Write a protein that binds this ligand. Structure first.
Ligand SMILES: *[C@@H]1O[C@H](CO)[C@@H](O)[C@H](O)[C@H]1NC(C)=O
Lengths: 535, 530
């Protein structure tokens, strides 16, 4: 040691770490980045559950983000900030199982509550190193301990031959779990309270958080949860065992391959090779045609999430859940004909019925008719501006809003304290067109407090709003309640109940309560539509 | 012998009575025979023209009501009695009435011909709410109404047979129209400006005359208030009518000719006993005998017919009231009564839907339930009560009316549409029924102008307004006052804009889309589902 900053040397179960004093707007923070939490899932270890990181010697340098798990890189709009912001930002490699910790500087006196971030990316992409997940502001301004882990995505993370020894399924979720275990054992070394661990995540990350709520071994590893624009139930977060098996076999064939023999072959294929084909498994025209997601294997998920949210005891659970104004808009540009970032995307009725088939690929002819009918404004059934917005809502409501309204519903009714929001503020800095509104993913930069960095060109009120949001989230991590125990002159955020179905709007104005989360429409998707398949 | 009350029609001479109306006298001619009494061997058969008569036939009093079920659900309650027969029941009933201004019109007056409702099982031209005195006095209109055969007497068919070919109640109506072409001039009427108006079954009948070629040269315009030829209750298929007929015959104990001869030999009241037992089927609209799609009077189902028709030179006024379905709930629908506020349980509501939409499969019931539920207050008895009313109103009246208005407009007719939202101060049903089926007629007919009836001074003006709308449409095809700038104007209903007006105490408001989303559900979705 000798000369090193003493505030930046920590020991964990695996050995010694040297961190980095990072500069934040209102003062310094500590970052320990790229701490390994598992033996690299490489070689024979591919597709297999993660093994804990065998202890190292000397002082590990933990001052940079590590490799990002091997994934498909988005190339729809080269140069485009609005898509690149999600692209991997460190080397792609299968050796990717590391996690990051941000803590106050100096590391705090008494043990602070911990927030853990599980990123999204539809289970096919993502990294804890992306800028919009920088934990420094929450660390600095809210005295929070923040942790984020890398977990395997795509085939490496989720390709499953259910029932086999060699590719059991859900290993991405199992990487996430090992990181939570690591948190329990080690977070205290950084002044973290292993008895106050809140999970938060967004899209597939929010679905992840939901599945930890539903998976017993993972239940003992956290206390509160926050699900932003995602759910474990719903059309895209899981697969039946058989389907997962079909998809893995099909991919195996595509790359040129008794389960052992099959996976053995797969394992000898180069990483990129697998990534190059993961999209071909469903020629099937479908936005959410991502083939490798969590499998209902009767192990990690003892049963479908839908089943488990209708029969679980959530007496002891505080949950924060919400959606953004325009969940679907973002998705339209990725293969719904007529939609683009570069024009107003006004579509024709023909393009609407066509987009409904693609957006809802599980839908029969009669169901597509049902959807089209429910979303048509019969005053102006030909108006392109409306149809455009309709197509957005269909995709948005089917994939996010209704699963979330359902999740809030069942959980509240089944003993949970649920708090629900809808995020309504578009970034002054947003680089997507006006027609896309407040799109899926664009709350994250606010929760994380990015507008506090003066160099980012956010308006003043955005900087105030960010602070306000960070208060809600961390208050929730702290107490199970987003409200302020002291200051109650500014309006209260009531729990969501079956009785009142109350949620609040998040935008530049003070809090506003509303009743009913797309109540009528979600009744369509959650109650009616299923039965139109018992036919 | 007042020579003004004396007219020579093709059958002979008639003497009218000088009736008194608020601001002047009118000439009535009540109970004119337009057909030979359809009695004995003539039961179930097309009407024949009435034979000429010697001397001066007394036409100063209303004639017999066609033989019908008399309603006994709420005995002595004026809400129901007002619809009940107000003269002797008798199979001998084919009589019409003409009201005209006194002295009788100097030049040819547009004629309005009324057709009563009653679901094709009840009704009379002679009811108080169809009194033609005001429309004749105040607007100088020649107003005609006729009795037509109802129930088994008017609509019992054994399709394709010679001796009960069906639709005779409609043929009665037609013959009155024929009579008006031939005779109405002699009263000062203009046979070149005949306008038909009717409510409920009367509306559907009007609509059937639109859809029947031989009727078309007998009128020029039409008004269909709260009814349509299309929709669930107004028509039956050849197959189904024949089944209902033979089942009626079996229920009274009875080869086509032999079956009818046996029916013909049966007292009228006997058929009325088993009238309501042909569809035991716990619904409301379990009335068995209605117009039948016969390849004759109706060449094809009204749906088919309104879909392909060319309605080029035709003007139509159509509309609904604020709460069509409330009325029908009190008739055989559990939880509903004129006596309590009728706040219902969710379970009641689901069974209520299986009853109100008796055509509905398990699934479509579920659809209807899920559509009409207020998902914010899923259990509130006020909403489920009001919802039940809506389901029944929409399915049977509102959506059929929306659909026809759309089709006529699409195929070149000129369409004016309304919603009637004023609840009569003198109404006798409870508040939860709002503005129920039927309760617009009294205003169109001018009843509040009669001080003895205790209608508010506001309601009396509202009447004059509606009377102007109707007669203005009768005169011109356009309900708008041709000498009223600063209106605002009543726009034609088109498929693009979808404009109707609200008829109530506040001056006209133009609204767009007549239950657009909900009727899309009824008119586009359910069909596919079945
Ligand atoms: C906008 O761009 C898309 C994709 O290039 C194109 O297909 C669409 O027709 C355009 N929209 C219009 C009609 O301006």
């Amino acid at each position: 040691e000798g000369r090193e900053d003493p505030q930046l040397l920590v020991r964990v179960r695996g050995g010694q770490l040297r961190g980095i004093r990072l500069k934040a707007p209102g003062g310094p923070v500590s970052a320990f980045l790229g701490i390994p939490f598992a033996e690299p899932p490489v070689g024979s270890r591919r597709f297999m559950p993660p093994e804990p990181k065998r202890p190292w010697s000397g002082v590990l340098d933990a001052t940079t983000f590590q490799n990002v798990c091997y994934q498909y890189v988005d190339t729809l709009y080269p140069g485009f900030e609005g898509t690149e912001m999600w692209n991997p930002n460190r080397e792609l490699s299968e050796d990717c199982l590391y996690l990051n910790v941000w803590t106050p500087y100096p590391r705090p006196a008494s043990p602070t509550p911990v927030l853990i971030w599980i990123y999204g990316g539809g289970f096919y992409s993502g990294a804890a190193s992306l800028d919009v997940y920088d934990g420094r502001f929450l660390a600095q301004v809210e005295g929070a301990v923040l942790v984020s882990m890398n977990y395997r995505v795509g085939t490496f993370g989720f390709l499953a031959l259910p029932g086999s020894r060699e590719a059991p399924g859900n290993v991405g979720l199992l990487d996430q779990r090992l990181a939570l275990q690591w948190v329990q054992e080690n977070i205290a070394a950084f002044g973290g309270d292993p008895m106050s661990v809140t999970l938060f995540g967004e899209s597939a990350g929010a679905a992840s958080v939901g599945m930890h709520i539903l998976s017993l071994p993972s239940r003992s590893l956290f206390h509160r949860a926050v699900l932003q624009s995602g759910t474990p139930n719903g059309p895209w977060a899981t697969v039946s065992a058989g389907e997962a098996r079909r998809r893995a076999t099909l991919l195996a064939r595509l790359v040129g391959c008794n389960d052992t023999e099959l996976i053995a072959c797969l394992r000898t294929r180069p990483a990129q090779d697998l990534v190059d084909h993961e999209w071909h498994v469903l020629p099937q025209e479908s936005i959410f045609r991502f083939s490798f997601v969590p499998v209902v294997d009767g192990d990690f998920l003892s049963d479908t999430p839908e089943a488990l949210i209708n029969t679980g005891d959530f007496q002891d659970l505080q949950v924060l859940v919400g959606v953004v104004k325009d969940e679907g808009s973002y998705f339209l540009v990725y293969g719904v004909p007529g939609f683009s970032k570069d024009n107003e995307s006004l579509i024709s009725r023909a393009q609407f019925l066509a987009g409904v088939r693609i957006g809802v690929p599980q839908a029969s002819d009669l169901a597509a008719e049902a959807v089209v009918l429910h979303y048509t404004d019969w005053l102006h059934p030909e108006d392109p501006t409306h149809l455009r917005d309709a197509m957005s809502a269909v995709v948005g409501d089917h994939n996010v809003v209704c699963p979330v309204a359902q999740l809030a519903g069942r959980l509240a009714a089944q003993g949970a304290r649920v708090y629900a929001y809808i995020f309504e503020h578009r970034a002054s800095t947003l680089t997507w067109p006006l027609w896309m509104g407040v799109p899926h993913g664009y709350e994250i930069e606010f929760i994380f407090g990015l507008p506090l960095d003066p160099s980012l060109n956010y308006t003043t009120e955005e900087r105030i709003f960010a602070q306000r949001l960070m208060k809600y989230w961390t208050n929730f991590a702290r107490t199970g309640d987003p409200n302020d125990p002291r200051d109650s002159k500014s309006p209260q955020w009531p729990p969501y109940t079956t009785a009142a179905q109350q949620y609040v709007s998040l935008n530049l104005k003070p809090l506003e309560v509303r009743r009913g989360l797309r109540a009528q429409t979600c009744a369509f998707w959650n109650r009616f539509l299923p039965k139109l398949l018992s036919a």
